[PDB]
């Protein structure tokens, strides 16, 4: 039966998919030929193909907008129609749209080109990478770190402020014109589900859930913060108050997004040897071939398919040398038409082993939803791909797997102290980033909502810094600065809450798959290898793509319609008890009023 509108939309979607497959394949092939062999011919071909693809997409969008959505009763065609009908930027007038593109490119350029020069030696000038990152990573000098921090900020943020002001105003005009409340509501729209009874999800439910879960995360972070504060007091005597917040420029990176680089300064038991299996790999004369063969064997051992011969034939797995310069950022390419490759300049290190496992998890995700229609070939939401890669890397990092594969000696004794070392190193990275992410996105949401006037942007930014993250600026900043925009994601128009959601999802998935694998010991020692049941349970979710709602896909694996924090707390329980014992005679919490200046 059905209406006459539906059938027309069905025929249109068939024609659109069949026309778009080839254009997307050509554009992706062109971008691959560029990224592995940087020449001018290749960049010109890349830009030509990209402009052709964008023109085709805009033509098909303007055509598809003529089918009235309300009369469609088939959910798949409804999703594809909604995806195609997104106006995007087109609802803006021409002159302001040109100005918006101009300001976007200007911010990106000024970020990617800014240099700060040392006043002591005005001939020496450094950009952010690699100079400022190396200094902020390895320097132990308080004054030098403070100089780097203040020079970078007082240089780039002062320039960035007005561009960001106009960016905010234009983006809010655009978002309101496309029938949204603001640009933050637009961003939160990614999680909306509307139409399936019992699985719906509004855009404010996301805020509610994020706040409810950070409330439960708070105590573990408080204890970790107290421990790190004590260790830093031991590291910089007479500079840190035993009751105050941590100075922002002593956290291990340019912003404090990760406390990873404090492990050398905070290791609980430095007497034990570290489980670095790099030397064993090097002494057995392993190469990239062997590494990827082992990753493939791992993925096949749980019931997932092999890689295609095309992958092994077309991928570039080693540095082509000095004659041919390429981009070495590890990437997983879905070229279309069943062509899958990986571009990564692998070194013979344990980190590259783990990242090979991660990227091959990405590739397996991409392979699993290949039979879906074009516009449905994507993760359930923005957090699923990274969660899958991360659970792969977690399973691969367990010492049991390293022993069973033969790179670690069979007589390696697993004391209770190596486990605490491992859990602390994991916590510095995984839980240290959650308050930062939550606070950054809260500030962005509030700015877009118009709750923070322009004349107190930095005031509210540093108030939130103090209250939530427990971090205080080393020198006072007036409203001329724009310190939030000194981060890449802020100045390049990328959403940020995806990392919070993925951090929760990855431990939900780990709990589900280890319960399925009949694991009995502590969760952090779980290795899902040789569990075809877990493989099947994961594939049942992988195969859906974006055809079904993300709530149903998450329930299919974990049994819950919403994000949960108890998996993370169960992962960190031993470290939690160890900190609770270790902090018996320490102050837990912080006063929001002490400052490194007066």
């Amino acid at each position, epitope marked *: *039966a*059905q*209406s*006459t509108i539906e*059938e*027309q939309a069905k*025929t*249109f979607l*068939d024609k659109f998919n069949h026309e778009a497959e080839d254009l997307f394949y050509q554009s992706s092939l062109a971008s691959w030929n560029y990224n592995t062999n940087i020449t001018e011919e290749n960049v010109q071909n890349m830009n030509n193909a990209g402009d052709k693809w964008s023109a085709f997409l805009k033509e098909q969008s303007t055509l598809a907008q*003529m089918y009235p959505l309300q009369e469609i009763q088939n959910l798949t065609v409804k999703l594809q129609l909604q995806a195609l009908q997104q106006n995007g930027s087109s609802v803006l007038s021409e002159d302001k749209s040109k100005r918006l593109n101009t300001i976007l490119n200007t911010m990106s350029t000024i970020y990617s080109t800014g240099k700060v020069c040392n006043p002591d030696n005005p001939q020496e000038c450094l950009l952010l990478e690699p100079g400022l990152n190396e200094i902020m990573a390895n320097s132990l000098d308080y004054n030098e770190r403070l100089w780097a921090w203040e020079s970078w900020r007082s240089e780039v943020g002062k320039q960035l402020r007005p561009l960001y002001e106009e960016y905010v105003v234009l983006k809010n005009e655009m978002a309101r014109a496309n029938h949204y409340e603001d640009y933050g509501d637009y961003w939160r729209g990614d999680y909306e589900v509307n139409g399936v009874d019992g699985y719906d999800y509004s855009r404010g439910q996301l805020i509610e859930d994020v706040e409810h879960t950070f409330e439960e995360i708070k105590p573990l972070y408080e204890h970790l913060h107290a421990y790190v504060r004590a260790k830093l007091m031991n590291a910089y005597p007479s500079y840190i108050s035993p009751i105050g917040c941590l100075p922002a420029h002593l956290l291990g990176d340019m912003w404090g997004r990760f406390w990873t680089n404090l492990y050398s300064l905070t290791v609980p038991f430095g007497q034990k040897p570290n489980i670095d299996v790099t030397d064993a790999m090097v002494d057995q004369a392993w190469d990239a071939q062997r590494i990827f063969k082992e990753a493939e064997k791992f993925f096949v051992s749980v019931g997932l398919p092999n890689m295609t011969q095309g992958f092994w034939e077309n991928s570039m797995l080693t540095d082509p040398g000095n004659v041919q310069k390429a981009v070495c950022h590890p990437t997983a390419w879905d070229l279309g038409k069943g062509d899958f490759r990986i571009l990564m300049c692998t070194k013979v290190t344990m980190d590259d082993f783990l990242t090979a496992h991660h990227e091959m998890g990405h590739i397996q995700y991409d392979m699993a939803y290949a039979a879906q229609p074009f516009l449905l070939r994507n993760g359930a939401n923005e957090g699923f791909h990274e969660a899958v890669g991360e659970i792969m890397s977690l399973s691969a990092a367990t010492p049991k797997h390293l022993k069973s594969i033969g790179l670690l000696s069979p007589d390696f004794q697993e004391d209770n102290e190596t486990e605490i070392n491992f859990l602390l190193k994991q916590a510095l990275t995984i839980v240290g980033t959650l308050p930062f992410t939550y606070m950054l996105e809260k500030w962005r949401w509030m700015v877009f909502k118009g709750e923070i006037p322009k004349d107190q942007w930095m005031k509210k930014w540093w108030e939130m810094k103090r209250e939530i993250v427990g971090v205080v600026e080393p020198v006072p900043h007036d409203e001329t600065y724009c310190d939030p925009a000194s981060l890449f994601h802020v100045s390049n128009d990328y959403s940020f809450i995806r990392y919070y959601t993925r951090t929760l999802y990855q431990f939900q998935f780990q709990e589900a798959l280890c319960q399925a694998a009949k694991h009995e010991g502590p969760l952090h020692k779980c290795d899902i290898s040789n569990s075809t049941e877990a493989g099947q349970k994961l594939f049942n979710m992988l195969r859906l793509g974006k055809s079904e709602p993300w709530t149903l896909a998450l329930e299919n694996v974990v049994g819950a319609k919403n994000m949960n924090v108890r998996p993370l707390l169960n992962y960190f329980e031993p470290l939690f008890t160890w900190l609770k014992d270790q902090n018996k005679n320490s102050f837990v919490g912080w006063s929001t009023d002490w400052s490194p200046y007066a």
Partner: antibody
Amino acid sequence: EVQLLESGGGLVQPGGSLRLSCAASGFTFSSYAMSWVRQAPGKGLEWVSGISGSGDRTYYPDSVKGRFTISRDNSKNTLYLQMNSLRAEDTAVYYCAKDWAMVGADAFDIWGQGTMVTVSS
Amino acid sequence: DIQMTQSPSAMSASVGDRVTITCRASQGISNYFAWFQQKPGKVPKRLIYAASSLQSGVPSRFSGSGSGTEFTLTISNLQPEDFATYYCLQHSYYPYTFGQGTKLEIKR
């Protein structure tokens, strides 16, 4: 110009079979849905059957469901209607009409002359 | 199944009279509507195709109106060659259904 033509009308026994053909010319046959419309003698009209563009989804009405089968060969620009288990009530003139395209709300506009299908013992 | 009840069934009028034929749908059928004329022994010829859009080559005395659930065909001034049978047809939802027809006769 579009000049739909029909053939295949004759006399058949009750319970017999018959295959109607409708030859299309003058337009891009492969991009238009086609339909069959009959007229009982001295009565109104009814929608016998309908097909989609790429000869895939075929729709039917409760009266002649499961007895009739519509089909097309886009190569020969020919539309077919296969009718089995005919009964005395199927006596009617049958037309083949053009139908919707892919975007507009246009509908039946070019019809053939018809062919007379009498079912009697 | 949308069920179409046409009123009236028959109708007689003189040349010049204003004639109005109605076709009612039991539910909403959007703007997918069409009116067909049939002379005896000839093929139905389309007059209006989007409930209100006149067909090329059809005199302007024919006009169509209405939407939603109620629809009306109207002839502004009758003509000798206007004596025929008129059918309404909806093609929105499957299956499709015609009206019972309306025969417009001469008054003597």
